[PDB]
Amino acid sequence: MTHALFTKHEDTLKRALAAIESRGYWSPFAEMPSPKVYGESGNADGEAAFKSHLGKTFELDQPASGETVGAERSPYGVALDIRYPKSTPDALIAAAAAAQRTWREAGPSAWIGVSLEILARLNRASFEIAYSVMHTTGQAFMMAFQAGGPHAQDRALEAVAYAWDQLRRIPADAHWEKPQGKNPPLAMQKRYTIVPRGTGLVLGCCTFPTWNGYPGLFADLATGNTVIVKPHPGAILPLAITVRIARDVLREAGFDPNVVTLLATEPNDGALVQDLALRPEIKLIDFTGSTQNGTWLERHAHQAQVYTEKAGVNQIVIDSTDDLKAAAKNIAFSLALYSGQMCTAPQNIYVPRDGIRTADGHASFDEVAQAIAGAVQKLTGDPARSVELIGAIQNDGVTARIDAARAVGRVLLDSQTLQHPAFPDARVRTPLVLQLDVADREKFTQEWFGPISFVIATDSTAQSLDLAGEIAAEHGALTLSVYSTADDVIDAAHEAAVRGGVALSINLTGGVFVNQSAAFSDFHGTGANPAANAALADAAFVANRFRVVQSRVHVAP
């Protein structure tokens, strides 16, 4: 029979199915933190819920050792002092294994129904999650709310819809009847059982814990697997809150709450994670993080299906424009948003050394560079007007990388530290913009984490496009952006995007930035290049997380 939570959320599920196929605009979760949607005291109650976690041990009723763990620090300088019960990998693998049977037996309608109920409760907790994302990742509140709450919930629901889209096409049974020409037909009844892989592992991200973490977590749950969530040690709380709500729904639905457990760690957890990632019980791994750690998992966890999001080189090709100032302002927003700490933020900006055509005539390379650098300075230089745009720097390693990057080319706009007006100890810095030549490719085919960008002089737009496609294919990329008023250049940009396996944005001169993507329309990554071996989300992202075990028996024709 159909699980009650499936029937409760069936309309939302059906709408999501239509959304992934039509790929227009759709979102069931209000992205604006409006009192109309979330209540007049939504913000206040959320903030108090966040504050209640500080200076205390986060309660989880999963098997735990009696020791605690946790060293999260707020980029805004707020004391956190949050602790979590320390569980061993052994203990969590055992608890997941004990939880697998009744979860599996409840079948797809339960996996989908429970997943959608959890998403409904996570949306209700959006403010509490927003504050927890802000004070672990450093995202400004508005972005922490959207990226940590509704937008992450959108991507989670997208994954559930893709899961259901595959599951719903597999019949529970079939009558197989083959005529035997005047002899009686062969007739058998086939029965098909959906069997999840087993236990999945979610290895969390330090900048977008829920947005990057949710697709794998809910792809696992929607296909009947159990999940161990191992967040980035600098951003545990958003996923601890998530796990708590998931366990509530599973417990109320009559399942073992250890279908989902939380493995909190402190930094230097590498040996622990390597050993856990190779355990025979771990059949799925979803990882967001460094290229070296991601590729390590792909090459060594042979017992698991490994899905990875890694670093890439995001690129802008500037050929020509209808309004240099509008293009420059859009690029500047894209560089300043969360201080370039988005996996989709642009890094390399290719401009012909001889300049570009504009509506107001020709612009030299130097004029294009000054237009970008000046627009960044206008957006970021004033603390009162810019802190909500640039947010806070995630870790103390960026300051050293900023100074390293200063030496790499010619400085167009220096990075400076700002004093946040509301957080005296916040770690805040404006973007660094450098000038390079195409001859310096050794410097710009690297990913530079933080607010660092290179305006790079090329021989021609043809070279910009050849290089951009080559670098995306070889070194990975999540986004590619082109500015041109010429149809043939736009066509060549599509060829480069196909070559590079990277999503293309064209003439972004308004309110859409290359950093942004919408669930149910935009594939996040392609899975074709070294920045990620999977796309968020498509059929391939979910279709392997379950198997089908059949049986056959003769029946009457």
Q: Which residues would be at the binding site for Na ion (CB under 5 A)?
A: 340, 345
Is 476:312 a contact under the CB 8 Å cutoff? yes
Nearer to Na ion, 20 or 345 (CB): 345
In the shown chain, the binding pattern of residues 17 to 56 toward a second copy, with x for contact by CB under 8 A and - for none, equals ---xxxxxx------x------------------------
> Is residue 556 a contact residue for a second copy (CB under 8 A)?
no
The DSSP code sequence of 495-537 is HHHHHHT-EEEE---SS--TT---TTT--B--SSSTTBSS-BT
Q: Which residue, 453 or 526, has its beta carbon nearer to a second copy?
A: 526
Q: Does 248 bind a second copy (CB under 8 A)?
A: no
Question: Which part of the chain contacts a second copy (CB under 8 A), choosing from 91-99, 332-340, 420-428, 546-554?
Answer: 546-554
Smallest separation (angstroms) from a second copy to the CB of 331: 15
Residue 59 touches a second copy, criterion: CB under 8 A: no
**C-beta of 361: minimal distance to a second copy in Å?**
24
Would you give the distance in Å from CA 201 to the centre of its chain? 16
Longest Cα–Cα distance in the chain: 90
The minimum distance between CB 489 and a second copy, in angstroms, equals: 13
Residue number with CB closer to a second copy (23 or 51): 23
In the complex, the smallest distance separating the C-beta of residue 73 from a second copy, rounded to whole angstroms, is: 36
7 binds, among a second copy, Na ion, none (CB under 5 to 8 A by kind): none
List the one residue from 502, 519, 536, 537 that touches a second copy (CB under 8 A). Answer: 502
CB of 38 to a second copy, least distance (A): 16
Residue number with CB closer to Na ion (461 or 517): 517
CA distances from 482 to 85, 373, 507 (A): 49, 18, 6
CB of 514 to Na ion, least distance (A): 12
Residue 129 or 542 with smaller CB distance to a second copy? 542
114 neighbors 257 (Cβ within 8 angstroms):
no
- Tokens 């737009």 label which residue? 461
**Cβ(453)–Cβ(349) below 8 Å:** yes
Q: How is the chain split among helix, strand and coil, in percent rounded to 5?
A: 45, 20, 35
Looking at beta carbons only, is 21 or 360 nearer to a second copy? 21
| Residue 66 interacts with a second copy (CB under 8 A): yes or no | no
Are 70 and 264 a contacting pair, CB within 8 Å?
yes
Helix (H) or strand (E) holding 315: strand 315-318
Shortest reach from residue 506's CB to a second copy, in Å: 4
Residue 268: what are its φ and ψ, rounded to 5°? 70, 35
Closest CB 286 distance from a second copy, rounded Å: 16
Rounded Cα distance between 66 and 54, Å, is: 19
Among 166, 225, 395, 515, binds a second copy (CB under 8 A): 166
Residues 170-229 that bind a second copy (CB under 8 A): 171, 174-178, 180-181, 186, 188, 190, 192-193, 195, 197
| CB 198 within 8 Å of CB 139 | no
Q: Is 326 in the site for a second copy (CB under 8 A)?
A: no
SS3 546: strand
The partner in contact with residue 351, picked from Na ion, a second copy, none with C-beta cut-offs of 5 to 8 angstroms by kind, is none
Binding of a second copy at residue 497 (CB under 8 A)? yes
Given candidates 63, 86, 357, 523, which one binds a second copy under the rule CB under 8 A? Answer: 523
Alpha helices in 363-460 (DSSP H): 365-380, 383-390, 397-406, 441-444
**Per-residue binder mask for a second copy (CB under 8 A), 266-305, x = binder:** --------------------------------xx--x---
Amino acid 479 reads T
Nearest to 219, CA basis, from 167, 271, 151, 294: 167
Q: How far is the CB of 549 from a second copy (least distance, A)?
A: 5
Q: How far is the CB of 534 from a second copy (least distance, A)?
A: 9
Place of tokens 């979860």: 103
**Binding-site string for a second copy from residue 110 to residue 149, where x marks contact by CB under 8 A and - marks none:** ----------------------------------------
Which CB, 227 or 478, lies closer to Na ion? 478
Nearer to a second copy, 454 or 483 (CB): 483
Cα–Cα distance between 468 and 293 in angstroms, integer? 25
Helices (H), 125-277: 126-137, 141-148, 150-167, 209-222, 237-252, 270-277
- Residue number with CB closer to a second copy (32 or 79): 32
Please give the size of the binding site for a second copy, defined by CB under 8 A: 64
Residue type, 92: L
CA distance 554 to 557: 9
How far apart CA 252 and CA 101 sit, in angstroms, is 17
Partners of 482 in the β-ladder:
317, 506
Amino acid at 120: A
Q: What are phi and psi of 341, to 5 degrees?
A: -90, 25
Residue with smaller CB distance to Na ion, 340 or 409: 340
User: Which residues lie closer than 8 Å to 100 by C-beta, 6 or more apart?
Assistant: 196, 198, 199, 226, 259
**CA gyration radius, the chain:** 25
Q: Which does 340 bind (CB under 5 to 8 A by kind): a second copy, Na ion, none?
A: Na ion
- What is the contact surface with a second copy in residues (CB under 8 A)? 20-25, 32, 165-166, 169, 171, 174-178, 180-181, 186, 188, 190, 192-193, 195, 197, 298-299, 302, 494, 497-498, 501-512, 518, 521-523, 526-528, 535, 538-540, 543-544, 547-554
